[PDB]
Amino acid sequence: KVCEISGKRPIVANSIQRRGKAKREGGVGKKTTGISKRRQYPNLQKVRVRVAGQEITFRVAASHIPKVYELVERAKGLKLEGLSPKEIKKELL
Amino acid sequence: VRIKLLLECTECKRRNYATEKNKRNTPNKLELRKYCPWCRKHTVHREVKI
Amino acid sequence: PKHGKRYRALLEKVDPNKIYTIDEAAHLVKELATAKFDETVEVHAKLGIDPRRSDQNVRGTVSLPHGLGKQVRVLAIAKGEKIKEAEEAGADYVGGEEIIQKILDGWMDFDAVVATPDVMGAVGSKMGRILGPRGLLPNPKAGTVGFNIGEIIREIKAGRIEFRNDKTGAIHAPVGKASFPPEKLADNIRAFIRALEAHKPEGAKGTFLRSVYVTTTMGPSVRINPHS
RNA sequence: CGCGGGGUGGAGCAGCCUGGUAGCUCGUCGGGCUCAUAACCCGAAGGUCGUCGGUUCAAAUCCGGCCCCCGCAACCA
RNA sequence: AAAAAAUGU
RNA sequence: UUGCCCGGUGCCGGAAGGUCAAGGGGAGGGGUGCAAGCCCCGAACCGAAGCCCCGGUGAACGGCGGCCGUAACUAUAACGG
RNA sequence: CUGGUGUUGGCUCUUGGUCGCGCCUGCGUAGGAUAGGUGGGAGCCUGUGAACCCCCGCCUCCGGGUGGGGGGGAGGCGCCG
RNA sequence: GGGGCCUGACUGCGAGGCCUGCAAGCCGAGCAGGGGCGAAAGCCGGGCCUAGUGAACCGGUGGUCCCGUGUGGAAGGGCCA
């Protein structure tokens, strides 16, 4: 759905089907036999973490993974101990 | 046409062209012959393929 | 053991992991040329061109700078008045019309054998289905077919030798003895590598000299430098 | 288009990397063994080895190059 | 442990 | 009670090879720069399923013709080709 | 359906196709034996050790071939046949 | 019908008309350039002639005075075949 750290979501995108010689190659150019509506997805994965004594997971996009780890880092030097797992999340920046 | 074939000519000292035809089979092969050239003029001519 | 006690100290001096030149290979084969007869140079050069394809059919001639130091009995069919210009050009036998009748029934090898461009309608069947092993047969390429024949003789009798290529693009051609000094084994190895990268087949691929080695009589190479 | 692969008796198929024989059958013809027939059993007619160019001492064969088939993947102003 | 091995106006 | 045929097709198996995308890979070429360079193409080969091929399968889709020759005053032909 | 990657990290074992190089390898039958081609070619190898035993290293179309070591004592091999 | 030399089966054009809806289809003196046969007048812009073929739109090769995105060049176009 929605990558929580980066925010990247699903943007409309296309499916270009085309048969014929690449102009620069053989010649005559390349025709299109179709185009269609698809949907692109963020390579989100799942990741848990300590932080307080409560395991809180995150729906982060792939390449934004060692990021949360950077959050759990600065996270420490902070007013943490409130057993609100709920609250534990959004808090972090 | 088929065996006949589409022939082009050269200015045996450069480029130039004329264009007529062979007949691979029947007494043929190797095509050199005089013809007057545009790029200056007074030579003979080769064969090739394009 | 595996070779001449005379042969061995010829290698422990030529490291194969050291790039010698036409200097340290004209320097050190005066230390590898160990013996009691005068040895020449065995400068090969297996080319990179292909062999079976005619689009890379190597074949030239090299006029060495200071010579083999090794004579060469070169004759000539010669035809006409050049019957007399191949004997005032350095040669033993020249022009007699047909001496393909005395040279028929046993031979102990002289050296060079040539014939002019007009008697090449009757020069490939007599002793040309005979002298070809030691490829001495007359042809319009290797420097053995022209009316000026005596001039093809006066230069081969000066330090010239004949080159081309065998059943595997393997190239050999003599610089000269092991008797020629510092500038004398290098003045004839390089000048000779000036008629190979120049006769280089246009449809061949990669460096035309796959590996160059300067070796004396029966013995140890000096993996030389192709540029220096 | 390209990588392959393939054509040799009247049809069938080996000889295809090895060079050196043109064969293995079906089928017609003779001739063998029995007491005769059958059935097995032999020797032959017959193929530019598709074509032409070629290196060899010599080619179906290795080289060439194209006509021609069939597989695929691709090309179609 | 005589492979199979037909008939005969 | 449910026969004959797995050639094609589907399907299940299977591989010695054919072919085949991305990608890897870098031989060699080229565009420029006074050059370091930056760029483009990019030959060998390695690269899946797939289809070709190999076996199997009918209570899988389907199919299950013919036309000579053979017996007695013809016909017919279990018979064989 | 599947191949490349992302998520994706530890531990050995094993094989490639490569290519770096030291430089080591090859037998149908007829044969005395394991003859890759075509030239050189009547003589090299030994006192910087031969015939034969021995060991292990490598290869095997398991007969047989190759090199180092270590013994010894002065013998080996090749045209020709 | 046969024989000798040769290549005009030219390029650069084309007054002038046949037909005709377009557009295409067809004839061509003569000039210039440089040739061929020819003693020469001369003849030759393929074949005794009417069928032997298919607009453009995209594109491949050659050629080249041309355009070349700030500037020099390339990428890619134009045009002649």
Token pair 């092969």: residue:
B29
Q: Which strand H nucleotides have any atom less than 7 A from protein CB atoms?
A: 6-12, 33-35, 46, 58-64, 76, 81
Report the candidate in C64, C156, C59, C48 with the shortest Cα–Cα distance to residue C111.
Answer: C156
- CA–CA separation, B9 and B39 (whole Å): 13
- CA–CA separation, B45 and B34 (whole Å): 5
- CA–CA separation, A37 and A45 (whole Å): 25
Beta bridge partners of A60: A45
SS3 A14: strand
CA dihedral C193, C194, C196, C200 (to 10 degrees): 140
Residue C23 CA: distances (Å) to CA of A80, C98, C182: 80, 47, 7
* Entry resolution (Å): 3.8
Query: Is the CB of C52 less than 7 A from some atom of nucleic acid strand D?
Result: yes
SS3 C25: helix
Instruction: State the structure-solving technique.
Output: X-ray
Beta bridge partners of B43: B35
- CA–CA separation, C172 and C166 (whole Å): 9
**Which of the nucleotides lies closest to B44 (Cα–C1')?**
H7
Side-chain-side CA neighbours of C140 within 13 Å: the count stands at 5
Distance B27 CA to D48 C1' (A): 21
Joined tokens for residue A39: 């949907």
Cβ partners under 8 Å of residue C97, min gap 6? none
